[PDB]
Structures are given as structure tokens and as C-alpha cells.
Design a protein around this ligand. Sequence first.
Ligand SMILES: [Mn+2]
Ligand SMILES: [Mn+2]
Lengths: 187, 187
Amino acid sequence: QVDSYRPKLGKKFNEALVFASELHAEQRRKGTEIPYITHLLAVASIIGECGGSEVEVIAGLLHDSVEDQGGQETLEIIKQKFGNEVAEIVLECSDPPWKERKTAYLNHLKESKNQSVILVSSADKLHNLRSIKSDLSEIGDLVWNRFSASKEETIWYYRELLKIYKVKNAPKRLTIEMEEIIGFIAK
Amino acid sequence: QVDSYRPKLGKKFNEALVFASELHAEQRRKGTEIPYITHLLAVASIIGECGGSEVEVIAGLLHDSVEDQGGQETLEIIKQKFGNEVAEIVLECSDPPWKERKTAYLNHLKESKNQSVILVSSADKLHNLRSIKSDLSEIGDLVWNRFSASKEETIWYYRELLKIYKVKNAPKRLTIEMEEIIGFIAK
Ligand SMILES: [Mn+2]
Ligand SMILES: [Mn+2]
């Protein structure tokens, strides 16, 4: 259990792994029995594979913690454990008629001054898209029964997200695959 | 930091997250600066998404620990921390002319009596295939300069692995995607 010297993903990342898993222990991927931690681990992995910093990988593990697991009190815990830079990425990632809310979030991302937010966001969306594709191969169009929007609305939203990620210089390794999946799931 | 009641992925899984990250802290994905923990998190995620048990997800986090991070002494630590069932999956996953070694490992998987080994193995290979595909989109054929075998040998080996996973009833969500990626990377 030696602690290596100045590893890129070290003690704070390991603390974040445990914190994310404990915080989301009872949460499930919508419509399934799959533990939600699977999504957070996948997003953290993608961010790391894009050369993400420790702060960015931690923000990836925690990007759903304020929305889904306690709001402002959880944000304060994130600050205490992981610092304000992580907390600021998480808050900026966090999110009236549905279509206006979507447009507001898209413009929020478009105007962001934090490249870390674009990296975390695009990794989150890539994992969600891979998950739709995999579910389609198992249950077919039953996958769409898990969403709070139509297939057409969902495809529109992902297409708009992709355009923003391109204009904000998200990693091409992510946007290339996104574009392939979107075309696939659009039939 | 409440501990929920009997979560599927609980205290031992959280201990395994930390152990895997500490053990592999200095290891990098071959040919890159990417921390190796990214691979282990991705494999654990895939196993969980296929309905894997806690034992299976932990084995996924640890499937490269004996080969890459200390052999039999590390196996004994795995037994002490996570039990002999996890250790037995890890050992059975772990691996003379190259082509005969490959054939021996393929037959080893084919004869396995442990469905957990097939699940962990197929998740490992799916992540490796996704990684090749993503790297191809960034660096093109330079990806092949990272391997200890030719492109033709690598494609052959993945094709044979896929056939075994199908005959051993690995999850179709994994083998369907494997087959797509293999065809893509084969040009
Ligand atoms: Mn998310
Ligand atoms: Mn592996």
C-alpha cells in the first residue's frame, strides 16, 4: 500500500472515489437495477483518458452529486474535501417549459469560461450516449420508455450539445464518437 | 457519509477502488501518459452495467493486479482484503511461441467453469477495443506502434476471443459491440 511519489491521480482522487460511491450508493441508473456509481466511474475514466487533471477527474466523479445527492449542502462538503475548483466545475455543470430550459443550459455551456466544464460535460454525454446504444442492443425501442422527453427531442438535444462541444474545442476523441453514436441511435 | 443498508456495491467495493488505484498509481496505459486506473474503472463500470455482482465488479478492478503489480504476493493480499472468490477470478483471468501462448489462453477461457471469468474477461477486452478505436481517431495507424504483435495478429486474437465469449454466453450487450468495433478497426 505504498503511496507513490506525486502520482497524477492520488490521495484526493482516491478519497473522491469513495465519496462518490458512498453518496450515490442507493441511486440506480434510471429504469434499471444498475448502481449509479457505474456512470460516475465511466465518466471519470473518459476524462482521464483525455488527459484530464486530477481536479477534472474528481469533478467527473462528482458531476451529478449536487443535482442528485443533496444540493448546496453537498456542494459545501465537496469544497471541504476537494476544494473550490472542483466545486466550481460541479456547480457550473449542474442545471419553465422544457425546450426553454434546454436552450438555457445549452447557452450556459456555450458561454462558459471554464474548459474543465466542457471536458466533464462532454464525457458525461458520451457515456450517456454509449449507454443508450448498448441498451438499444438489448431491449430495442423499450429504451425510450425511460426518458422524460421524446426520441426526437432527445436526438435534437444531443445534436445541439455536440455542436457546442465542437465550438468549445472539446476533445475530438469524444466528439468523433458522439457524432457516430447520434447517427446510429437516430436510425 | 451515511452507509446505506445492504447496497449492491458497498464497503468492500469502495476498499477495492482505493486498493486498485494505490496499487496501479504509477502504471500508465502502454505508450501513453494516461493513468492505468482509467482502464480498471472502465472495466468495473462495464461489469456493473451487465448486472455484475460485487465480487465480479471487484474482480474487474483487480483483474490486472497479479500480472502487473506483484504476482503471488499481491494475490495473497487480494485474498486477505476481498476473499478467495475474488482472488480465484483474478487468478483464472491471469495468463513459448507467441501464437501457442495465445492459443493456450483461448483454450483456457473456453474450458473455464467460472462464468464470472467470462464476464470480467469480456469487459476487459471491450474496453481495450474501445480504446483502440478512440486512439485511431486521434493518431491513426500510429496506434499500432504500441503493440507487441502485428495488426493482423491482434485482429485474429480479438476475433477468436469474440467467438469464445459467444459460446460461453457472455452478455450480448458486450459481444454485439465487440463485433462492431473489430470490423471497424479491421478497416
Ligand atoms: Mn451524468
Ligand atoms: Mn485489462
